Design an enzyme around this catalytic site. Structure first.
Site, PDB file in Angstrom:
ATOM      1  N   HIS A   1       0.746  -0.978  -0.137  1.00 55.55           N
ATOM      2  CA  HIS A   1      -0.250  -0.158  -0.121  1.00 55.55           C
ATOM      3  C   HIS A   1       0.728   1.200   0.172  1.00 55.55           C
ATOM      4  O   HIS A   1       1.664   1.388   0.984  1.00 55.55           O
ATOM      5  CB  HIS A   1      -1.060  -0.165   1.131  1.00 55.55           C
ATOM      6  N   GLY A   2       1.001   1.952  -1.068  1.00 59.90           N
ATOM      7  CA  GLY A   2       1.811   3.076  -1.190  1.00 59.90           C
ATOM      8  C   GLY A   2       0.913   4.582  -0.825  1.00 59.90           C
ATOM      9  O   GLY A   2      -0.460   4.332  -1.275  1.00 59.90           O
TER      10      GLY A   2
ATOM     11  N   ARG B   1      -7.892   3.121   6.310  1.00 58.86           N
ATOM     12  CA  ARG B   1      -9.174   3.441   6.418  1.00 58.86           C
ATOM     13  C   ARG B   1     -10.092   3.549   5.282  1.00 58.86           C
ATOM     14  O   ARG B   1      -9.491   3.831   4.114  1.00 58.86           O
ATOM     15  CB  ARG B   1      -9.322   4.836   7.315  1.00 58.86           C
TER      16      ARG B   1
ATOM     17  N   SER C   1       1.748   0.014  -6.448  1.00 62.40           N
ATOM     18  CA  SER C   1       1.618   0.922  -5.151  1.00 62.40           C
ATOM     19  C   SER C   1       2.743   2.246  -5.292  1.00 62.40           C
ATOM     20  O   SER C   1       2.322   3.096  -4.646  1.00 62.40           O
ATOM     21  CB  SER C   1       1.868  -0.167  -4.078  1.00 62.40           C
TER      22      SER C   1
ATOM     23  N   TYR D   1       1.539   5.616  -6.332  1.00 67.36           N
ATOM     24  CA  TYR D   1       1.280   6.386  -5.437  1.00 67.36           C
ATOM     25  C   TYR D   1       1.756   7.065  -4.254  1.00 67.36           C
ATOM     26  O   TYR D   1       1.590   7.862  -3.603  1.00 67.36           O
ATOM     27  CB  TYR D   1       0.241   5.897  -4.831  1.00 67.36           C
TER      28      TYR D   1
ATOM     29  N   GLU E   1      -5.376  -4.991  -8.410  1.00 62.54           N
ATOM     30  CA  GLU E   1      -5.960  -4.071  -7.209  1.00 62.54           C
ATOM     31  C   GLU E   1      -6.640  -5.200  -6.391  1.00 62.54           C
ATOM     32  O   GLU E   1      -7.652  -5.548  -7.129  1.00 62.54           O
ATOM     33  CB  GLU E   1      -6.568  -2.929  -7.595  1.00 62.54           C
TER      34      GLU E   1
HETATM   35  C1  LIG Z   1      -7.054   9.259  -1.410  1.00 59.62           C
HETATM   36  C2  LIG Z   1      -5.784   8.541  -0.734  1.00 59.62           C
HETATM   37  N1  LIG Z   1      -5.525   7.097  -1.119  1.00 59.62           N
HETATM   38  C3  LIG Z   1      -4.349   6.475  -0.840  1.00 59.62           C
HETATM   39  O1  LIG Z   1      -3.344   7.286  -0.505  1.00 59.62           O
HETATM   40  C4  LIG Z   1      -4.279   5.064  -1.384  1.00 59.62           C
HETATM   41  C5  LIG Z   1      -3.301   4.941  -2.428  1.00 59.62           C
HETATM   42  C6  LIG Z   1      -3.229   4.000  -3.263  1.00 59.62           C
HETATM   43  N2  LIG Z   1      -3.993   3.533  -4.284  1.00 59.62           N
HETATM   44  C7  LIG Z   1      -3.897   2.109  -4.805  1.00 59.62           C
HETATM   45  C8  LIG Z   1      -4.776   1.963  -5.887  1.00 59.62           C
HETATM   46  C9  LIG Z   1      -4.656   0.664  -6.528  1.00 59.62           C
HETATM   47  C10 LIG Z   1      -3.659  -0.101  -6.051  1.00 59.62           C
HETATM   48  C11 LIG Z   1      -2.539   0.244  -4.966  1.00 59.62           C
HETATM   49  C12 LIG Z   1      -2.805   1.575  -4.128  1.00 59.62           C
HETATM   50  C13 LIG Z   1      -1.958   1.752  -3.321  1.00 59.62           C
HETATM   51  O2  LIG Z   1      -1.066   1.153  -3.043  1.00 59.62           O
HETATM   52  N3  LIG Z   1      -2.315   3.142  -2.777  1.00 59.62           N
HETATM   53  C14 LIG Z   1      -6.153   8.690   0.811  1.00 59.62           C
HETATM   54  C15 LIG Z   1      -5.689   9.402   1.659  1.00 59.62           C
HETATM   55  C16 LIG Z   1      -5.790   9.607   2.984  1.00 59.62           C
HETATM   56  C17 LIG Z   1      -6.951   8.882   3.373  1.00 59.62           C
HETATM   57  C18 LIG Z   1      -7.742   8.248   2.425  1.00 59.62           C
HETATM   58  N4  LIG Z   1      -7.515   8.171   1.284  1.00 59.62           N
END
Ligand SMILES: C[C@H](NC(=O)CCc1nc2ccccc2c(=O)[nH]1)c1ccccn1
Length: 354
Positions: free
Chosen positions: A206-207, A222, A244, A247, A336
């Site tokens: 999870h990035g 969350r 990941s 991101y 994903e």
């Molecule tokens: C909008 C942001 N989302 C993220 O930081 C997750 C990023 C993410 N998306 C993915 C999508 C497909 C596969 C992998 C990833 C992933 O590793 N990170 C976020 C930030 C703070 C609270 C909730 N959401």
């Protein structure tokens, strides 16, 4: 009378982490990278009320995008009054597409976690009365209520993690592993134990932005009411580090580029596989515990190993990505992995990568 500042208990790598994830410059940089006006929205002025009002403004835009209401222009302007943006002091642009709407929702979810980190750091009255204080970095670490233990390169899982990173990261410019911490956020233990019957556990990437790392350490991964993406309102993971890593918003420090990535243990249970985008999903179909948007590739499953975490076998991919003929026409290049209950993930590791 001067309070004593006690010496820092943390090792150098940990002090650097804690410095980085609470850094005001980091937070402001992040707000700049999201087009926010940091002069009109200083960190100390950010409030839960403003963020709430921003989401209400976006909610109104979403309803208009889906009868004589206000135009998208008018509804955009409101949003930009509430959440000041800087576009070279030109007019910010109208939020007139589902893509731009989700982009703004995602920006506010980041900003909410920045505000969380500021609220976490408010000085308590117990702190104002005591005659000695922890070192600032010890204080910040303790605020997380999250145990971090730095691993050395002979730790049992160290090689396995490094192999996962190296085998599934970009082939040409792989992230370079600097440190790994084991993560034990308690409060997570018990809800996660709830899924002990659920086999099919996997350690997944999870990035995120560096600006949300403190929030994650305090509160886990969350799902929020405005969370979204190509597979709906869940927590997104990848089996390929390169996915990941896309991101990860890193930050220039000296002559290098620093980024942080999590590994979580995900109780996937009975998997529902899809091969086309469905941004409307809010849970797996009945009878299923997760949704996997299957990629054209997957880390070669013949190379999976297992790690024993709290006495449960957890699959860890070790293979380079290989083609999956059944999903060669999927709308997803890379998989994903989605869960729709926060309790199905437990944070296990944090990686610093350059
Ligand atoms: C909008 C942001 N989302 C993220 O930081 C997750 C990023 C993410 N998306 C993915 C999508 C497909 C596969 C992998 C990833 C992933 O590793 N990170 C976020 C930030 C703070 C609270 C909730 N959401």
């Amino acid at each position: 009378s001067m309070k004593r500042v006690q010496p820092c208990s943390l090792d150098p790598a940990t002090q650097k982490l804690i410095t980085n994830i609470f850094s005001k410059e980091m937070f402001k940089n992040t707000m700049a990278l999201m087009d926010l006006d940091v002069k009109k929205m200083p960190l100390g002025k950010l409030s839960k009320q403003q963020i709430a009002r921003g989401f209400e403004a976006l909610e109104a835009l979403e309803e208009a995008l889906k009868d004589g209401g206000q135009s998208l222009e008018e509804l955009s302007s409101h949003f930009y009054t509430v959440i000041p943006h800087n576009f070279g002091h030109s007019q910010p642009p109208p939020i007139n597409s589902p893509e731009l709407l989700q982009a703004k929702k995602d920006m506010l979810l980041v900003l909410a976690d920045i505000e969380l980190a500021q609220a976490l750091q408010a000085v308590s009255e117990q702190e104002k009365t005591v005659e000695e204080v922890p070192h600032p970095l010890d204080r910040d670490y303790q605020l997380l209520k999250c145990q971090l233990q730095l691993l050395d390169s002979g730790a049992p899982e160290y090689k396995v993690i490094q192999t996962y990173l190296e085998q599934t990261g970009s082939n040409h410019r792989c992230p370079t592993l600097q440190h790994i911490w084991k993560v034990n956020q308690e409060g997570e233990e018990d809800r996660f134990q709830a899924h002990s019957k659920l086999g099919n556990r996997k350690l997944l990437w999870h990035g995120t932005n560096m600006a949300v790392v403190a929030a994650i350490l305090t509160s886990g991964l969350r799902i929020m009411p405005h969370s979204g993406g190509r597979v709906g309102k869940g927590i997104y993971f990848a089996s390929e580090n390169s996915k990941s890593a896309g991101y990860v918003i890193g930050m220039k420090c000296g002559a290098h580029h620093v980024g942080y990535m999590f590994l979580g243990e995900v109780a996937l249970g009975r998997e529902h596989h899809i091969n086309t985008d469905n941004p409307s999903l809010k849970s797996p179909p009945p009878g299923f515990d997760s949704v996997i948007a299957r990629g054209h590739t997957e880390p070669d499953p013949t190379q999976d190993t297992e790690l024993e975490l709290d006495g449960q076998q957890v699959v860890v991919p070790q293979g380079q990505p290989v083609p999956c003929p059944e999903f060669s026409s999927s709308t997803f290049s890379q998989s994903e992995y989605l869960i729709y209950q926060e309790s199905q993930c437990r944070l296990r590791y944090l990686l610093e990568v350059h």
